[PDB]
Design a protein around this ligand. Structure first.
Ligand SMILES: Cc1[nH]c(-c2ccccc2C(F)(F)F)c2c1C(=O)CCCC2
Ligand SMILES: [Cl-]
Length: 121
């Protein structure tokens, strides 16, 4: 059914991000002390990781396909906010962001976004 179909696609997309070269740095929430960034949660007020999104998909927390996108994009927005442009981490976030936006097209996920935006308008 409709929601089952884009839940399955979102699970496939998120797993492809996890397996992207360097994607492991977004898999879990940043450990401020262990990663030597003690000010991280002073800057990032809405943290997000791939495993957070996977948990929301597993538990059924998303009601609209755009909610999945907003969370994944939040990962990359947090990355660009905290990390200086050109740094290793910022470069990796820009790369996976571009990969994610292309996957939303080639999988057809954006088609579910368009349908759902019309249903709930
Ligand atoms: C998105 C993000 N991920 C990681 C991370 C996590 C676990 C292992 C390794 C890393 C790292 F290599 F990227 F640093 C960090 C991070 C930041 O925003 C802060 C800068 C460095 C820490
Ligand atoms: Cl690493």
């Amino acid at each position: 059914s409709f929601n089952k179909q884009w839940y399955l696609l979102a699970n496939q997309i998120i797993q492809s991000l996890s397996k992207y070269e360097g994607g492991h740095i977004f898999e879990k929430l940043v450990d401020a002390k262990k990663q030597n960034c003690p000010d991280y949660y002073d800057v990032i007020k809405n943290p997000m990781s791939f495993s957070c999104v996977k948990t929301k998909l597993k538990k059924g927390q998303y009601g609209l396909p755009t909610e999945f996108i907003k969370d994944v994009q939040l990962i990359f927005d947090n990355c660009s906010l905290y990390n200086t442009s050109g740094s290793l981490v910022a470069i990796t976030g820009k790369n996976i962001e571009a990969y994610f936006n292309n996957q939303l097209i080639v999988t057809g996920y954006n088609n579910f976004v368009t349908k759902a935006n019309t249903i709930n308008e």
